[PDB]
Amino acid sequence: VNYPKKKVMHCFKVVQYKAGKARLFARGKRRYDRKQSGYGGQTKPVFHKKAKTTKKIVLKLQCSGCKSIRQVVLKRTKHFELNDKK
Amino acid sequence: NHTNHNQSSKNHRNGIKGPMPLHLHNSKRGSWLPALVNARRVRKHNQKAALKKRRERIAAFAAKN
Amino acid sequence: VHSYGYKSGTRHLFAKKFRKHGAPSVSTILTNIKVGDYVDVVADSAVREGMPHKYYHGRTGIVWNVTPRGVGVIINKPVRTRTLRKRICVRFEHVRKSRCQEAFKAKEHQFQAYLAAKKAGKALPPLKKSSRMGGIVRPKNVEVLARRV
Amino acid sequence: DLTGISKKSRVIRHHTYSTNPYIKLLIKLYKFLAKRTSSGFNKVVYQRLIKSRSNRAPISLSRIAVVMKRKAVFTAKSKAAPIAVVVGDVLDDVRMARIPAMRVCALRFSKSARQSIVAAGGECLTFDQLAMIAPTGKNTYLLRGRKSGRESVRHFGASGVPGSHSKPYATNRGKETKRGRRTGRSYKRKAFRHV
Amino acid sequence: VKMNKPMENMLRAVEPYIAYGYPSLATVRAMVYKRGYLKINGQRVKITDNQMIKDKYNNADIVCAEDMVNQIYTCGKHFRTVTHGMWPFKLAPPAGGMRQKRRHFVEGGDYGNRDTLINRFLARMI
RNA sequence: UCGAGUACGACCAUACUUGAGUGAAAACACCAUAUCCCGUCCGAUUUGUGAAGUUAAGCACUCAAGGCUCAGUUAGUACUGAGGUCAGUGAUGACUCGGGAACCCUGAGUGCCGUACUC
RNA sequence: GCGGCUAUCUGUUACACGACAACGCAGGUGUCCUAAGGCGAGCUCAGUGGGAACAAUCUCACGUAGAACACAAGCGUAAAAGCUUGCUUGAUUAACGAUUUCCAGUACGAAUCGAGACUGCGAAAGCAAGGCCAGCGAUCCUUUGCGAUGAACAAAUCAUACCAGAGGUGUCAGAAUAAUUACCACAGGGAUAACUGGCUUGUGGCGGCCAAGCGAUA
RNA sequence: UCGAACCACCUAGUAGCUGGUUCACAUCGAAGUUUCCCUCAGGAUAGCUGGUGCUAGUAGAAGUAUUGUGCGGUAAAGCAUGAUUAGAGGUUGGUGUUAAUAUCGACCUAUUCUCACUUUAAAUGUGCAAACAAACCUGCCUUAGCCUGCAAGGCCGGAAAGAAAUUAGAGGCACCAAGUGGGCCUUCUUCGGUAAGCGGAGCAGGCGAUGCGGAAUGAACCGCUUAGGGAUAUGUGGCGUCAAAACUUAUGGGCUCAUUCGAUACGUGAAAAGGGUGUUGGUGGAUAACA
RNA sequence: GUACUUCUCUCGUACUGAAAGGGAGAUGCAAUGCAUCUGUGGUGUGCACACGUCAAAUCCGUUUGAUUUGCCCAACACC
Ligand SMILES: [Mg+2]
Ligand SMILES: [Mg+2]
Ligand SMILES: [Mg+2]
Ligand SMILES: [Mg+2]
Ligand SMILES: [Mg+2]
Ligand SMILES: [Mg+2]
Ligand SMILES: [Mg+2]
Ligand SMILES: [Mg+2]
Ligand SMILES: [Mg+2]
Ligand SMILES: [Mg+2]
Ligand SMILES: [Mg+2]
Ligand SMILES: [Mg+2]
Ligand SMILES: [Mg+2]
Ligand SMILES: [Mg+2]
Ligand SMILES: [Mg+2]
Ligand SMILES: [Mg+2]
């Protein structure tokens, strides 16, 4: 699918949310560092079977007015470009 | 094994209870607001009237008794 | 149980009738509904935006809600051992003002107006006559019957 | 002889499962009266005695005062003060400071409800003492007392069904307010639904 | 039972089970006198005296037993009252027997409508 | 000036569409024109603007066919709910107690009304 | 056992309300679109019947959809819902309020009626909170957005919390997964095969009348 | 004792699996279905059911009709979307011919044949409503709607009665808790299969869970459904003996001889055409002569 | 074992929020103030009310007003 680089808003810069930092010191990973530490098995399950190949698109409508990023979420599209209507 | 047999006779043992009448759960709620926001304010006045109508009663029923 | 969508097994049900297609009436747009009257929820196609589920098609019931362009209708649904007063939300074109009471709307309108005429009224104009009794009937053509082959 | 009439039989509670020897006296008193009289009261006050202990809900003096004030506002203003009969038992009410001089007839009274009456100016009766005053129960205002709001009746329900403001059976009050009772935990028990 | 339009269709639908007809005067009181029971206070109380009748019906018109008959023999004005005030007539199986019970009265069996021939059928049952 | 005339319509073919006939006043209609808003690649369409004119189309009125509507059949037929220790054949067939068609063909007729104006 | 389908969609099954099953039949789905969304206007499609330097297209007829509508199919639509153009982002926030379908009347998913903004397209009435109806995902965790706590106090980070989303569980109401056993063991099962008893009468093999004629029959 | 010894212990290991589970009577009394589950030998959830109830309850009653009033597209029907196609002969291709000719397809026609797609086209169904506020004569208040009053909502008093049958075997909820979640047969119809005592369904009835009476015999069929007895009378089925009943009916009308007659349904089906020059019946058509 | 027991704890009379935290009487005048008792309507025992009604006689079955207890439904207020 295509999507415009610019959307006018009356209530604007598009970034296509792609986060995933995966911090250390996250409470669920500190637990994990503690919980899967040492002996025992791989002490937690892990998604092995296949997946939904197509991924849903969060889209962050960051207003050019300084602050307060919005987030819209599109549908599941394989190819996503911000070509903006050539 | 889908059967649907004996089911219509199970639904008619304890009976297929009739529906509740309209004076049951007639909550005009989730309906169209500009109606119920007016059918609200008119209930407030009609309650100030219901309270007021009992005020003269007792006071008429006192002196006139 | 491969398909059970919101519009399943409904070819002939939502299909318009023969030689009567297209836009809805101007009567059905100029109807007048209140909270309380009865309506036949006859889902017509050719509007395709606001049709109820199949089940609520031959069904008639109170209007508990009249939004700007959606009539809210309660409908009795015999689920398994009890009936639910379902609360459907459809548009006006899927709705008729249900006759289902003209049977006594028009009865007690003239029935009382003559019971009053029979009780007090002004006078008692004689009404419909008796139906089933005897009679020395005079025939007008004799006949018999044996066979025709 | 096909009937279908198999389940139309209602459970009426013919007798009492109480073993209190002072209520089997009131019951024999109010079988005599409830049977060999044309009293509508005595009929009604008899089924309420043989009734159980959870079904004879107590009325507080507050409830008795207010409803006896709603009677005494429309009377001859000098006719008589009817007797507030409750077939449960009367409990004091620290939310009612001033109590009128009202006659009450209960199977029981709190020690603080009997003194609150007698201090007020009224006299609390019994049922062997009301069979002497209006045994037919003329001028008696019969009362139940609220049995809703009882903690038993507000667990009745499912509490996970839309439109079910019942209380789940949970010792830990901060145990079950998570997923299923939150709008942001993939579904929130719909607080309203037309039934 | 009356033979209104609503009623006689309730007979149409259950004819394999019922066997009806039109009762002679002689068979209406034979029912009421030999087999007539009333609904006194929810009980099947035999009609032993006219005093049992007026206490049960009370309806200013129904005094004696030949009076219940005239309310039943004609469609009457008190017919939903005289009949509903009575218990269904628990009867004996007809002496001499029934020809069949599975086939209509016109096809050699015996059920459905037998116009005025149910007297020859109730006589053997009263 | 009287029936209808336009424009608004409600039922939506009895109203449709065919070959014509018919149009007496008005009134629609085509009609004149790019002198403006206008947008037409086009004065076609529409949209500025009026009357040399014309019933040529259009349109309503007439007959007069498919189709459509009403009925007479078709037909108590097909089919059907119920009932047989019915009959055979495991083919439906009749019966009894009821419901009861359709296509067809012979017909009937081929719109109706409702608000304002105008005469 | 391989083989193939559990989550879903249309027709059919399916019996004139609804419901209704089969490794039941036929097909589709896990997408694709900044337009294939929205709106207004203009127009009328498939086909055909004839016509013009070039030679298709401009011609006008007649054209109830025989086309188109992102796709499966079915409904549906003709001064459109299709075609062309215009101007646009309502495909957004939605205080989400209610409801429908599945239903246990629980989710979810998809829909329907709304309300509040802010809006777009329209002269306007109205139309639009996607492209109708298949196209999708819980707890925990990670993650971003959004603007109270860390409990002796104070400050800044850091973490957490509330809130709304995303990363996903296709076994699709969501364990983190390869064999082989004839050396096998156990619990049981005729719920279930080989076996055995039947049943199935078409297969495989036997027979009848009638023979174009073969040779009307030796 | 060995595809992991033996002893003791954890250990009374776990078992959705198998077996068993101890008195009586009384009162009632089912289910094999819904959805969800690494679920399909099990659970959970509804339904079914019991107990305890609460409550003003001839009503907010009904597996029923009537009356109106909607709905539908199956049966039958009929062949436009399709057919399916050859039979009568005549624009478009190739071709066998001597601008003259066909030839088969496409077509062209009047048709035709018999089918799924067609139509408010059934029966059976099903949704609703039907008497004390559903109509009136009135009057409130905020007026939301729309430019005082209509209409609207929440109300209301004055007034209202019936000249939709029946049962009217009492309505309404509520709580607690089992068991069941392997059904099978059958009627009607009907999907799949060569077929079935087959698999999958819809409807109702059953059996299960249930005897009794009789179809010799049978879970299911036919009657009837069930406290302990007596009598009277029937049901289904019968009346020659077994075997109660025509002690072999005063039986009446015909039929029937059968070298395996025939004789109670559903048992499974008993016998399929075919003929005759056979015994009894009926219709078409001669002679007034059959041999 | 029985008898006694201040003290405390426990459950609950108050709920809610993730948390900091907060925290429910009604009516009239007001948009906080002052007297400071069911909160509203509806369905609604019993009794008192008058209302007549075959009613042996007159006490009760009929009923209509009053208050309506419990209960339920609707929508106020308040936390
Ligand atoms: Mg409380
Ligand atoms: Mg017999
Ligand atoms: Mg599509
Ligand atoms: Mg398509
Ligand atoms: Mg649209
Ligand atoms: Mg669903
Ligand atoms: Mg949702
Ligand atoms: Mg979608
Ligand atoms: Mg749209
Ligand atoms: Mg057919
Ligand atoms: Mg019904
Ligand atoms: Mg039996
Ligand atoms: Mg036998
Ligand atoms: Mg005997
Ligand atoms: Mg003989
Ligand atoms: Mg009241």
What's the Cα-to-Cα distance from E70 to each of E62, E80, E126, rounded to whole Å? 10, 13, 19
> Do residues A3 and A59 touch, judged by C-beta distance below 8 A?
yes
Residues D86 and D106: their CA atoms lie apart, in Å, by 5
Q: Does C82 touch chain B (CB under 8 A)?
A: yes
What are residue D181's DSSP bridge partners? D188
Amino acid (1-letter code) at residue E76: G
To the nearest whole Å, the CA of B58 is away from the closest chain D CA by: 7
| Residue among B8, B26, B29 with most chain C CBs within 10 A, to mutate | B26
DSSP E108: T
Q: Distance between alpha carbon C47 and the CA centroid of its chain, in Å?
A: 21
- H or E stretch at B33: helix B33-36
- H or E stretch at E37: strand E37-38
Q: How was this structure determined?
A: cryo-EM
Residue E83: closest CA among E71, E92, E91:
E71
How many other C-beta atoms can be found within 10 angstroms of the C-beta atom of residue D109?
Answer: 22
Exposure of E97 in the CB half-sphere (CA atoms within 13 A):
3
Residues E39 and E86: their CA atoms lie apart, in Å, by 5
> Do residues D117 and D110 touch, judged by C-beta distance below 8 A?
no
What's the Cα-to-Cα distance from D76 to each of B55, D122, D159, E12, rounded to whole Å? 18, 20, 50, 65
Amino acid (1-letter code) at residue C3: S
Residues E107 and E109: their CA atoms lie apart, in Å, by 6
Residues B4 and B8: their CA atoms lie apart, in Å, by 8
**Tokens 């089997």 found at:** D24
Residues C107 and C113: their CA atoms lie apart, in Å, by 10
Torsion of CA C33, C35, C39, C45, to 10 degrees: 70
**What does the block give as tokens for B33?**
């607001």
Rg (C-alpha) for chain D, rounded Å, is: 22
Q: Which residues of D touch B20 (CB under 8 A)?
A: 195
CA of C65 to the centre of ligand 8 (A): 27
> Do residues B16 and C81 touch, judged by C-beta distance below 8 A?
yes
Determine what percent of chain D falls in helix, strand and coil, rounding each to the nearest 5: 25, 10, 65
Question: Hey, which chains touch B, using 3+ CB pairs under 8 Å?
Answer: C, D
Residues C111 and E34: their CA atoms lie apart, in Å, by 45
> Do residues D14 and D47 touch, judged by C-beta distance below 8 A?
no
Report resolution in angstroms: 2.8
What's the Cα-to-Cα distance from E38 to each of A59, D151, E58, E82, rounded to whole Å? 84, 51, 13, 9
- Residue in C closest to B21 by C-alpha: C85
Exposure of C69 in the CB half-sphere (CA atoms within 13 A):
6
Do A and D touch, counting CB pairs below 8 Å (3 needed)?
A: no
CA torsion sign for C86, C91, C92, C95 is negative
The answer to whether the C-beta of B60 is closer than 7 A to strand I is no
CA of E94 to the centre of ligand 14 (A): 14
Residue A12: closest CA among A56, A62, A49:
A62
